[PDB]
Write a protein that binds this DNA or RNA. Sequence first.
RNA 1: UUUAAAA
Lengths: 241, 302, 490, 222
Amino acid sequence: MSRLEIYSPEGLRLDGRRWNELRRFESSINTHPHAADGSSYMEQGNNKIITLVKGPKEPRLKSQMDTSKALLNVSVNITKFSKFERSKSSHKNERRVLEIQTSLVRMFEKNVMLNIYPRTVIDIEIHVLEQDGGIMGSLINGITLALIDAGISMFDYISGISVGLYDTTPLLDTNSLEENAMSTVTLGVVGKSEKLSLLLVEDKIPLDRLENVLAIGIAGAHRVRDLMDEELRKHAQKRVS
Amino acid sequence: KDIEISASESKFILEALRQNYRLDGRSFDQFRDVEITFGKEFGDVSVKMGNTKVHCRISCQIAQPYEDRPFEGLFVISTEISPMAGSQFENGNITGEDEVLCSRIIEKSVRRSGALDVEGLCIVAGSKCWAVRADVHFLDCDGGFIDASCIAVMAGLMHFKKPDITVHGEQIIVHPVNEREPVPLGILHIPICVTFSFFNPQDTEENIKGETNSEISIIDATLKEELLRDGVLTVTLNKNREVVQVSKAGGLPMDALTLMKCCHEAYSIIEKITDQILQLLKEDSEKRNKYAAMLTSENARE
Amino acid sequence: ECLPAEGHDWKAPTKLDDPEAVSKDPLLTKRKDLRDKLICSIDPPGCVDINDALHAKKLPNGNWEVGVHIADVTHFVKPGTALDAEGAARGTSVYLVDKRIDMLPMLLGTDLCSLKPYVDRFAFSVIWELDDSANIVNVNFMKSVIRSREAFSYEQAQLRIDDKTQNDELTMGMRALLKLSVKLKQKRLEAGALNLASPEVKVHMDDPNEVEIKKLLATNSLVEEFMLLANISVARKIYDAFPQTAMLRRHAAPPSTNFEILNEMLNTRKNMSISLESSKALADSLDRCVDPEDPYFNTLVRIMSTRCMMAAQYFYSGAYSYPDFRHYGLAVDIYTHFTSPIRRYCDVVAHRQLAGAIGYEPLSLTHRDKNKMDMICRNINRKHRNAQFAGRASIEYYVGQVMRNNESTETGYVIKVFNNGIVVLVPKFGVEGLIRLDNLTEDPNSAAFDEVEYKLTFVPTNSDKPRDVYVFDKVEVQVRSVMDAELLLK
Amino acid sequence: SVQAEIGILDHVDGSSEFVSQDTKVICSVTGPIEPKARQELPTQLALEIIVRPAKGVATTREKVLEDKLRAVLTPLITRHCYPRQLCQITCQILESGEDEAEFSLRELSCCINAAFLALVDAGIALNSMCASIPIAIIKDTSDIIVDPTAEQLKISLSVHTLALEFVNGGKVVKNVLLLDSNGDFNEDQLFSLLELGEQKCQELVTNIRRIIQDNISPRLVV
RNA sequence: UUUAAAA
């Protein structure tokens, strides 16, 4: 937009929220019962992510097959119309995207019980229809809710939260305008614990401030877990009855 | 086409770690001694820490700036691993997860974190700028790939000198290297990478919902310690107490207290490696400028 | 590689007729052995670049043997070498306050070329033969070897001349150089020369300490007159042998436009006028523009009239006629620079041309080309103004550091008035200061500016009586540290 | 005078580093090892030659550099005694020592020597020995000079990279392995440099033999 | 587009 106030002395951010408030969280389960065994339409703020889980099934070729566990594939596709300005580049084979795809596989191959499904492959297909800051964390929450829909055994929830540091004030769930004005940290908390399966810091942060940012980060991630959990309670109860 | 590890060797190294023993004889928090070998031309740096040997080559050229940032210069880097450092690296596989994660970590440490003065690399806004390229050559692999490569690039940029340019309104004349002395690049901070390897003597189940943290963390693992590694962490700090970048994805889910402890342990390491590069660059400058005391023009009076 | 291989161990040959010395320097035979002359040096304290060296010896016919000796820089800086081109682009040494950009490496400007005492040094000597009235009888130029007996400073040479128990041949030679300088200066003032003042002030370090005004001594005019006489004598000689490409310096006459606004301020507020019919009339008029109450006011007119003076210029004789060689400030038909080759590059070219006139070494073709000489003169002229503006800014910076780090009250004179600002010149610090109207009064809306009387009426801060401030007013200024370094008015 | 070190890498069968003037090339040899499907040869040994420049990626300039180096090492190795096997020979040029865009003769001369040295340390069957030198002619005197510097190439009319093969104590020349030339020359100057290049490579293998003996002998029975 | 002198 223009030159906005990031965090006014009145504690209000550019979009109206406060320092410890999250964007609206509206998740959806089983949105593609005809295209994949797992489905999750993640709508965290303006972000709109479609996550599909095709598997566990036989691999298309017997070349790559682990006879003691499963193969976890993640396909993150950022559409050209993800932002306001239509992307001119290719995005698919981008080096920044391959880092995200790999970071997601490592994150879940330790949490997903690949041993229960030997000699199989689990394909995860992601399509980002719109992004607005904190896209990494929303990618996390989408995969979690999409595997559960597919009936894949997991040890716990994996929550994705994004935290920014503006001067001396942490900010939960940073949007695009906030990421372009401060440092950003995306966390990957496991359940109600403090175990971090992901820790990405891509901008300079003072060491004396990182610990407090992590504490407020994992605290908001637990809040993200409950919103996903309450979505599964409502989906399971209305489905049985 | 991959390294075969015997069950006997795998069990021995894990139990040795449970007794505070490493095959090479270091400690759990001892970084390998780093050695910097400067080549002939500027930007030719060879880094040797342990048996891992890496070589970096710095270059630059005139290129068009980005349309969204016309006041900044470009920074290119590509780390293609050849079978020279080991026959397990298939040549031509530029999309390898190790090569991908290495470039993205150094690119965040140098370019995104503001180590290289990109604004000083601007000649004319939105038309002409410097595109500094960092070619990293992996010579001998023994763990600590992104640790040594980050030391090589940072030692290379501080040792490299760009050609001099005089702006006459809209024209740009690149002065030959023999005509004018090249100008060194501007470096704001010195990002130094320190990796952490994690092991669990238990299992995955006792680690997800287990309060008792029995993890074993070692600083700068070797190749054999890396192949038996469970979780991996990479932090990057500078002497200004600032966290340049952090990359931890997968492996053992660790807690916040141990990750904060890794940074404070890594700061004492990067603080010493920083002063070594500043000292070894000072000694290499006096090697080339032996009679530099007589050629000084700006001299004090009385 | 262009420097001598001996480095700091370079020594002048004790025997100029030595067969081994003349094998490395065949031009040594064309060099005089003036090492028997009692030569001394008088330079400011803390000097490193010793360019000049004077001596005096009474001749048996009632005259004096006065001779200045200049550092033979051209024996080391040869044309066409990388050492020459590196000094030609610098033009002159820039003298700041803490640092000092040198035109030549310190091997030459400090040790080998500098006329250091007690050591044999190469020099380009100019020997005269003055009478009791300081009249030149015959002049001779030659490259020689000298050994400086001493190296006094201005404050040290003054004590040795004023002392009466030190009566030796070297001290008595300094006595003659004092009585001959005042006779050379008197005949110049009668010929139309100018005597302008300048706030020459310096500071001390440990880190700015304090601002101290520099004092003049009788020995300052001693060296000054013989440096002028040397430059004049060498000017006529290099022009007599190279009238097409002689390195000279001129000074055009100040137009009536420059002294227009200055005379209007002196006539409408002080009823004084500076004569412009001749250079002598300008000097004689400044001596009468003195205020009875303020003795410094006479020097203030000399400072403000210095800005009205035209800028001197380096040039080659092949671009002008002889009546255009006039130097307005010195009132001499021709002039050049020769007595400072370590500092200015103009003296480097003058030394090469003077050596060719005597027959020491043939002048290089780079100093016989009008095109090459023209481009050299435009560079050493641009490098001359840059050096002066840099020296004034370095003094202004370190003085400005004393303003914020040392709060005090000093007296200053105004030199210009505006509708919303007053410029004040302080003799204690030797720098000008602007006092804006917002930082001078509380209500700037109730002010009036009279352009015919050069006054600005306002209501001072913490005062209900409006004050009328004119030009050339002796006021007391203050300094504050109001920052979120500011001068006010008392 | 050139410098050379053998056995510098720990994860390859054979390593070497050839330094001449300003050009520095590190080579790595690993074999015999299991080849791939498209690489295995039914009767003889397969070669995987890969050279890399100091700056930038491996463009088509280094592709012809691999094909010429391949023709030098292929007849030098007894390939028939390693059936269905592979040997990786990677050459990494640390410093070019010339102009990469205008010249490429000094790097070929150092890659040949560095590869032969690494083939000796790895213990591969070699029928003979090898030596390569760069040769150019200054347009001023029009005479033949070996190992010309970087400034001597820009004034050269034609460049040459002669690779020879020596037997019987590094004296008898069995065959001329490679003689790559580009520029302006005639038949009179061809044998004028070929005769001069044969005696400059003879003292090279004599210098190579001394180097590869000061390092292999201490590792054996000593 | 600040004279002269030693720096």
